[PDB]
Structures are given as structure tokens and as C-alpha cells.
JSON list of C-alpha atoms in Angstrom, two decimals:
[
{"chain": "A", "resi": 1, "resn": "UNK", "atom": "CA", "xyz": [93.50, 103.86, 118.59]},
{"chain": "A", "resi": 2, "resn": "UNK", "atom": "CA", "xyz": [95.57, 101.55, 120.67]},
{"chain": "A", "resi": 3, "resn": "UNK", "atom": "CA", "xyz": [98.66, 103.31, 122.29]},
{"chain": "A", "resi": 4, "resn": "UNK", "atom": "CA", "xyz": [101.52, 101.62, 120.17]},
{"chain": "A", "resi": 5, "resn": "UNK", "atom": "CA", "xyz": [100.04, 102.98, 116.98]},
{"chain": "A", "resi": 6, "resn": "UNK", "atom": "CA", "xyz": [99.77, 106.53, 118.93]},
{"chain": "A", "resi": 7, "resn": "UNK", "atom": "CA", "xyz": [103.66, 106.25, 120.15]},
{"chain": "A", "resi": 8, "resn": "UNK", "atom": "CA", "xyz": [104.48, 105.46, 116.57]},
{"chain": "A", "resi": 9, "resn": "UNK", "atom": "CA", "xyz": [102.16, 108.12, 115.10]},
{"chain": "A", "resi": 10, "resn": "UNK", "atom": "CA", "xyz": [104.27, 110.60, 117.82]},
{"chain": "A", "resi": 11, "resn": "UNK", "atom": "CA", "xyz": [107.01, 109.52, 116.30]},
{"chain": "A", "resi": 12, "resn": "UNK", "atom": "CA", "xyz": [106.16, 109.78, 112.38]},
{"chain": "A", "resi": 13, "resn": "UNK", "atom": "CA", "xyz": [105.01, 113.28, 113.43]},
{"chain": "A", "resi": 14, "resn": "UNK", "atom": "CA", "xyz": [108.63, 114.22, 115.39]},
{"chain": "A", "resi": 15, "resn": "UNK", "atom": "CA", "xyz": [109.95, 113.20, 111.77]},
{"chain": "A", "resi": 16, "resn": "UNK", "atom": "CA", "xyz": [108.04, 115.33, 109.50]},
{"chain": "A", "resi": 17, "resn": "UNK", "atom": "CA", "xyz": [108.11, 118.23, 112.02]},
{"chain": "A", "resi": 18, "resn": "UNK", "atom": "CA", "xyz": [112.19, 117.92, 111.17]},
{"chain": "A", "resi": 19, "resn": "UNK", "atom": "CA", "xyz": [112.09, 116.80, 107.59]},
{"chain": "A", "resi": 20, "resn": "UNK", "atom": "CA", "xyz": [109.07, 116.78, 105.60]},
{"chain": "A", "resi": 21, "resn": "UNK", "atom": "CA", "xyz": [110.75, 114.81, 102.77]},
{"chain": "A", "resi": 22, "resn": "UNK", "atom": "CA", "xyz": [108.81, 111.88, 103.42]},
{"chain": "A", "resi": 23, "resn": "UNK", "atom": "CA", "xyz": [105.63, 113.70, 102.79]},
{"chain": "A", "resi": 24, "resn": "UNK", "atom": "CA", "xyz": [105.85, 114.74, 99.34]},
{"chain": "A", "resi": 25, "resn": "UNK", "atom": "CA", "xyz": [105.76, 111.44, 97.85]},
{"chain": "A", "resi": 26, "resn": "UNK", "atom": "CA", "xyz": [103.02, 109.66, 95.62]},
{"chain": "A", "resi": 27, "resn": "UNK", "atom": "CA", "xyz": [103.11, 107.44, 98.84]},
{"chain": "A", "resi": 28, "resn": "UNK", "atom": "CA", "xyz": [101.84, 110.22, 101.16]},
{"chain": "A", "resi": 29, "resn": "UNK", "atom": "CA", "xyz": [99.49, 112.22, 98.87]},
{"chain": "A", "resi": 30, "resn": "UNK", "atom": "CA", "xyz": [96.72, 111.15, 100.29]},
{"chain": "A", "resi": 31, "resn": "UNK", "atom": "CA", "xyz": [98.65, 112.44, 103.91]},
{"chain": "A", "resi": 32, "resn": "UNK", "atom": "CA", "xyz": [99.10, 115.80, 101.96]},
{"chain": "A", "resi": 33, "resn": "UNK", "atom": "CA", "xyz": [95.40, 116.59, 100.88]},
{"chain": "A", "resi": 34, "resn": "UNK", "atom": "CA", "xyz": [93.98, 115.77, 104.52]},
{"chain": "A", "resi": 35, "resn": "UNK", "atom": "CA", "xyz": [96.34, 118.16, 105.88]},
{"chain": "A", "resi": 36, "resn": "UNK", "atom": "CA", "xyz": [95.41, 120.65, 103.01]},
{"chain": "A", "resi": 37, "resn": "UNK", "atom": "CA", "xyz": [91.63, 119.76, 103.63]},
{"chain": "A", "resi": 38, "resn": "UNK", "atom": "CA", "xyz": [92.22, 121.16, 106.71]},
{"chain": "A", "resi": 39, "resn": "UNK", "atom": "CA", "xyz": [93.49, 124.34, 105.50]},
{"chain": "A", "resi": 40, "resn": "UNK", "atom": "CA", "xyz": [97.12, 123.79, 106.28]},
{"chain": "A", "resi": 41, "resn": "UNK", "atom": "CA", "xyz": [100.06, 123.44, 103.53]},
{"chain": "A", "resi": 42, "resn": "UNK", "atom": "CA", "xyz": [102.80, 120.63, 103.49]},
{"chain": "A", "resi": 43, "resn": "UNK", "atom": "CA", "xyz": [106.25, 123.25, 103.59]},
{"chain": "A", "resi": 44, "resn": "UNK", "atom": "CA", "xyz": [108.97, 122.03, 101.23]},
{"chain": "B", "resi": 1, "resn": "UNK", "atom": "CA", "xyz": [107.27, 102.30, 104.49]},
{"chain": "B", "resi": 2, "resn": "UNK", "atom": "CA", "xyz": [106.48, 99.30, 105.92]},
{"chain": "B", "resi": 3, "resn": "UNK", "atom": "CA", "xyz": [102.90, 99.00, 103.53]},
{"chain": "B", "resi": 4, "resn": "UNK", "atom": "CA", "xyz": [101.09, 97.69, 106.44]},
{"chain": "B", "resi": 5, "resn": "UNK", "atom": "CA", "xyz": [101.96, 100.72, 108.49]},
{"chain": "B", "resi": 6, "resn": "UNK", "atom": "CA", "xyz": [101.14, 103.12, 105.26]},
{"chain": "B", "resi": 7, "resn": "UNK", "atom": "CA", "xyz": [98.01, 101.26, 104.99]},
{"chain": "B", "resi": 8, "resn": "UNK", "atom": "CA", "xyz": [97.40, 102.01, 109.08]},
{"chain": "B", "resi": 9, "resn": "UNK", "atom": "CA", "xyz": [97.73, 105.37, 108.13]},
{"chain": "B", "resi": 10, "resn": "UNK", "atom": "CA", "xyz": [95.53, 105.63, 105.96]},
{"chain": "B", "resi": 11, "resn": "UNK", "atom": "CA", "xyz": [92.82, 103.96, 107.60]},
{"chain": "B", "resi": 12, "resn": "UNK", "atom": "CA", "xyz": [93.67, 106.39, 110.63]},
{"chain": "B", "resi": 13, "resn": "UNK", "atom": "CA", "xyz": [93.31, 109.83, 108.32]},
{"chain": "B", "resi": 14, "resn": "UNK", "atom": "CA", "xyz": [89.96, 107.71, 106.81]},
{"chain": "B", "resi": 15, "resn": "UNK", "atom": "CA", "xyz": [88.91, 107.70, 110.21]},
{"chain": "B", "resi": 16, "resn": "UNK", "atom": "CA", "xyz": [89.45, 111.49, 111.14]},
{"chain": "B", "resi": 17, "resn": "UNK", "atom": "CA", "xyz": [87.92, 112.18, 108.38]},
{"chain": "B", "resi": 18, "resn": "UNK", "atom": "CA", "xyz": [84.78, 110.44, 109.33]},
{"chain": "B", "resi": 19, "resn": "UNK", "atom": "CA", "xyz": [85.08, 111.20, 112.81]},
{"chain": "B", "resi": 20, "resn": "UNK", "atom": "CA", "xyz": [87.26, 114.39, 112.92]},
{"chain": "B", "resi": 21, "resn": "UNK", "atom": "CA", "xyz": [86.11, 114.22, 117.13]},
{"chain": "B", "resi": 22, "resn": "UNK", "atom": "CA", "xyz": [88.95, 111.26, 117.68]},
{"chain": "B", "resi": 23, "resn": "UNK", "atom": "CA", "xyz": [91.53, 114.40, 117.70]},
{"chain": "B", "resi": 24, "resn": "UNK", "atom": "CA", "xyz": [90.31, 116.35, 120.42]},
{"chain": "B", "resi": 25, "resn": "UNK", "atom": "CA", "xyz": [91.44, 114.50, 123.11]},
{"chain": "B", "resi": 26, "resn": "UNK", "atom": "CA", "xyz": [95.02, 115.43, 124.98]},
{"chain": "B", "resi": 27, "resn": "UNK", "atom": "CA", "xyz": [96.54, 112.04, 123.53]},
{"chain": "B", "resi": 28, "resn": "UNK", "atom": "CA", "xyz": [96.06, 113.93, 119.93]},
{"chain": "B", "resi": 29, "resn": "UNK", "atom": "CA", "xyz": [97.32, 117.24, 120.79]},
{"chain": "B", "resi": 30, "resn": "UNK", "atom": "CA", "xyz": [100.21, 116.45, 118.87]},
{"chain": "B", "resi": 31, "resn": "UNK", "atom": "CA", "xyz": [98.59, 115.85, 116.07]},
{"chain": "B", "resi": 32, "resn": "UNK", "atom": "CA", "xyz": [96.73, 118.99, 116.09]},
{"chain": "B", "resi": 33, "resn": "UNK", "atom": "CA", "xyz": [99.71, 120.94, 116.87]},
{"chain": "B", "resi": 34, "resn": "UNK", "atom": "CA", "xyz": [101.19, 119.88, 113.64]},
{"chain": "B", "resi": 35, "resn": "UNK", "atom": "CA", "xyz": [98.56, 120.89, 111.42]},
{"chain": "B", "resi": 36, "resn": "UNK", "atom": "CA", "xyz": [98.49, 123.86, 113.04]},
{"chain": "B", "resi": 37, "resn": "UNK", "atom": "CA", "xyz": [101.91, 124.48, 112.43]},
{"chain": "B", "resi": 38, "resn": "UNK", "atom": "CA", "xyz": [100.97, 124.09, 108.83]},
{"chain": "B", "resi": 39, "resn": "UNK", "atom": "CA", "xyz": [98.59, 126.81, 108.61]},
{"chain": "B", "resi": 40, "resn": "UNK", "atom": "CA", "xyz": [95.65, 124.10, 109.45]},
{"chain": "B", "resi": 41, "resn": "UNK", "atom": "CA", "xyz": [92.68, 123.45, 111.99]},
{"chain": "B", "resi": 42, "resn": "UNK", "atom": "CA", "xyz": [91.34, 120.14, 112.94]},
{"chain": "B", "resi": 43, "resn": "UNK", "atom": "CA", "xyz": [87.54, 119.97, 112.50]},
{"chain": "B", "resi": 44, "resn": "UNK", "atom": "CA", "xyz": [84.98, 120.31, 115.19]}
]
């Protein structure tokens, strides 16, 4: 990917990292069951 | 968000998903690091 989209993507991640809010929207579902694909959970 | 960026995203986790080898590079650690942090592991 070209390496604006990566600073951003560093950036969305800082974000969550802090406050997850973001994630547990209709919005980001799709966000939600990769990560849980993976085996990891989205913490509240 | 911005839609076009949501819609970036989502072509990014499409592409993982086909190609889960894009995240093994140093540029991605991040990314790893936070699914790790959720209990996850990237695919090989």
C-alpha cells in the first residue's frame, strides 16, 4: 500500500489502541470479524 | 468516517484476507501488534 494510507492506518490504529469506541459500530463490523477471524476480540 | 477512507479500509482488510502475507513485513508490525493485543494472530 502506498505510505500515506500506511501513516494514516498508524494512526487509526494509535486511536483504537486508546479508545475502541469507533470499532463497535455497524460501520466497522466488518473491522470487528477480521480481527475475530483472527482469533482476537474487539475489548469494550 | 470519511466513506472513501471506510471504503479504503475495507478494500485493505479484503486484501489481507486474500493475501494475509502483505502483514509480515516491518512496515505492518503495527498492525500485527494490535491484533495481538487482542488475543489475535495474523495468518501465515
Amino acid at each position: 500500500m502506498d505510505p500515506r494510507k500506511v501513516s494514516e492506518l498508524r494512526a487509526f490504529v494509535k486511536m483504537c489502541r486508546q479508545d475502541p469506541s469507533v470499532l463497535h459500530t455497524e460501520e466497522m463490523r466488518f473491522l470487528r470479524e477480521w480481527v475475530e477471524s483472527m482469533g482476537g476480540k474487539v475489548p469494550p
